[PDB]
Design a protein around this ligand. Structure first.
Ligand SMILES: *[C@H]1O[C@H](COP(=O)(O)OP(=O)(O)OC[C@H]2O[C@@H](n3cnc4c(N)ncnc43)[C@H](O)[C@@H]2O)[C@@H](O)[C@@H]1F
Ligand SMILES: *[C@H]1O[C@H](COP(=O)(O)OP(=O)(O)OC[C@H]2O[C@@H](n3cnc4c(N)ncnc43)[C@H](O)[C@@H]2O)[C@@H](O)[C@@H]1F
Lengths: 253, 252
């Protein structure tokens, strides 16, 4: 297997940018000042005309300064290990915002790209496996996306975690949330609200107030943020149950 | 009503995004490129009074834009836009019009023909409560017909059973006018899902009122028919947004 770059990278980027600019999230997120051409130039210069592993956490800095929107107070959501559940519950911006609803998360979501030295300065044929590149190159785009997103969060933030993974603690200093988001929360954040997912029909592994969740509680306390934690709150349980209505946890009476 | 800015840039942007990245495993790519689809779409209403359109204006657009639809997956709805879309879940459970290339590119857009250059008005539109019916329903009517005509196997129809003023099924809805009569023999069954909104009085029921009207219409069309009121998967989805509603009670 070989990793396949996105085709027509620039067309896809400028199409999604233009689509978002004029039509998406209009009453939920603000427009940025840069036009789509200027955004493309700052994104392209981060990686182009260089070897595909020759990136670092500064490479997209200009792109993110251009692309970063102010985010709605109390609405920012973070997640680890529970992508679909967290996005279903955030509900496309209606209840919470995720990185994928913001301009840069939306334009680059699912895309694959890499630089090369030879013209045209990016590789249309193949990209290396991220594991062959140093971590600061591998994490250069989504690590900067994550720090910049977390740095803009104000008021209460909400963090959804996996509480049924016997091998991956619900909270980990090594996840993108623990590397790039929690430590870049500013003093404009007042509270971290944790939602522990207990996946239906599976063994419960982590619980509020114990283990990594307790380590997280104390970390948050020390940043002078308030903290709360809930396991399968009803609003979330109902979503899980809609997809698996026979599960025991969804029984009626 | 205010038209969408940069109509062509928006249309061509969503077209490109769709083509390269959207529904790649669920729906096929159409043959025409984005610039040919734009020509078709534009000529449908360009350089014509914003109200001189008929059920045939967008015929060639829809013909270039039509995709074959996954069998058993098509979803229709009347009066429950949000619930129907949330249940279909962006192509993961069912397909709606808005997941297809044409529904996706034009969803929520507003656009107006005008006679004078440049063929379309970028500042104002006819509040289409003004227009003749056939010019009003002209885009989404052809969309609905072309979509419904691409449907295969079982189809699903979600309705509101809690509206005292609007029947669950109406022959004058887009479903009644344009979808149900455009179902070909490749369709074999119509499955109705009656929504009973939380906290509201039950108005409509399977096997009565406008739903019995419908069942006899479906059975006469040589399709199978079934019907269910708040099946659990739909119920639980409604409960997520209103979890204290009496209907949403769970085991002690
Ligand atoms: C900022 O960062 C965290 C998200 O990353 P974490 O490392 O905290 O969480 P984790 O789930 O451990 O890693 C992300 C995984 O999700 C998958 N994924 C990324 N992008 C997608 C899309 N677009 N669709 C489906 N799955 C996706 C990756 O493959 C990773 O394994 C959040 O709080 C903020 F975004
Ligand atoms: C094709 O038709 C139905 C939805 O239309 P109905 O008339 O059956 O349903 P109702 O909820 O009573 O009317 C809503 C109207 O909105 C217009 N419309 C259809 N599709 C769109 C999109 N995508 N965006 C904006 N407006 C739309 C129509 O005038 C509807 O009548 C579904 O089974 C299929 F969509």
């Amino acid at each position: 297997a070989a990793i396949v770059p996105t085709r027509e990278l620039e067309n896809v980027f400028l199409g999604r940018c233009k689509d978002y600019e004029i039509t998406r999230y209009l009453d939920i997120l603000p427009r940025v000042r840069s036009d789509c051409s200027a955004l493309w130039k700052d994104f392209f210069k981060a990686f182009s005309f260089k070897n595909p592993c020759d990136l670092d956490l500064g490479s997209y800095k200009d792109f993110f300064t251009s692309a970063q929107q102010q985010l709605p107070k109390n609405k920012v959501m973070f997640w680890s290990g529970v992508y679909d559940e967290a996005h279903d519950y955030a509900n496309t911006g209606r209840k919470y915002i995720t990185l994928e609803d913001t301009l840069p998360g939306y334009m680059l979501n699912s895309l694959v790209w890499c630089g090369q030295r030879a013209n045209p300065g990016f590789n249309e044929k193949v990209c290396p496996d991220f594991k062959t590149c140093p971590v600061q190159a591998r994490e250069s785009f989504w690590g900067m996306a994550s720090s910049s997103y977390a740095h803009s969060a104000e008021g209460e933030v909400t963090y959804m975690v996996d509480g049924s993974n016997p091998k991956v603690p619900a909270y980990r200093p090594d996840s993108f949330f623990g590397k790039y988001e929690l430590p870049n929360l500013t003093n404009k954040v007042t509270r971290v609200k944790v939602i522990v997912l207990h996946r239906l029909g599976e063994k419960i592994i982590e619980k509020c107030g114990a283990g990594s969740l307790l380590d997280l509680e104390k970390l948050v306390k020390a940043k002078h943020f308030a903290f709360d934690c809930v396991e399968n709150p009803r609003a979330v349980l109902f979503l899980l149950c809609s997809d698996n209505p026979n599960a025991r946890e969804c029984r009626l009476a």
